[PDB]
Amino acid sequence: YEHVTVIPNTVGVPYKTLVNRPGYSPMVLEMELLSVTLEPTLSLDYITCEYKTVIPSPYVKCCGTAECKDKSLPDYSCKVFTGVYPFMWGGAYCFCDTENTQLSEAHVEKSESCKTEFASAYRAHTASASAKLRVLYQGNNVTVSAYANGDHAVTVKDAKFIVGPMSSAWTPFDNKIVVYKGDVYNMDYPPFGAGRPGQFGDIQSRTPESEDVYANTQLVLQRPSAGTVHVPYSQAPSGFKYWLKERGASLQHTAPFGCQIATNPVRAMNCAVGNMPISIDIPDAAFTRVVDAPSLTDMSCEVPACTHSSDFGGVAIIKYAASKKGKCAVHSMTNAVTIREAEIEVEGNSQLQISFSTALASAEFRVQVCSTQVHCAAECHPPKDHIVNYPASHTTLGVQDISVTAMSWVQKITGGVGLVVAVAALILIVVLCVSFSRH
Amino acid sequence: YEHVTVIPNTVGVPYKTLVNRPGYSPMVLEMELLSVTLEPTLSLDYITCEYKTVIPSPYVKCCGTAECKDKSLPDYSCKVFTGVYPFMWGGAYCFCDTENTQLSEAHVEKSESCKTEFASAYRAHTASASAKLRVLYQGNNVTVSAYANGDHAVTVKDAKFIVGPMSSAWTPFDNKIVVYKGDVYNMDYPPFGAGRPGQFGDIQSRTPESEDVYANTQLVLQRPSAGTVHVPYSQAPSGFKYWLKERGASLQHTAPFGCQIATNPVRAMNCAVGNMPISIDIPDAAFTRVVDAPSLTDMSCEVPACTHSSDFGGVAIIKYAASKKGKCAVHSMTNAVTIREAEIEVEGNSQLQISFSTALASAEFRVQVCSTQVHCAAECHPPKDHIVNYPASHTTLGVQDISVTAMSWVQKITGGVGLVVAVAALILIVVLCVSFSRH
Amino acid sequence: TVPTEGLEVTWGNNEPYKYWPQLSTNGTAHGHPHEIILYYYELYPTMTVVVV
Question: Where would you find the membrane-spanning parts of this chain (chains A, B) (predicted)?
Answer without folding.
Answer: 417-437
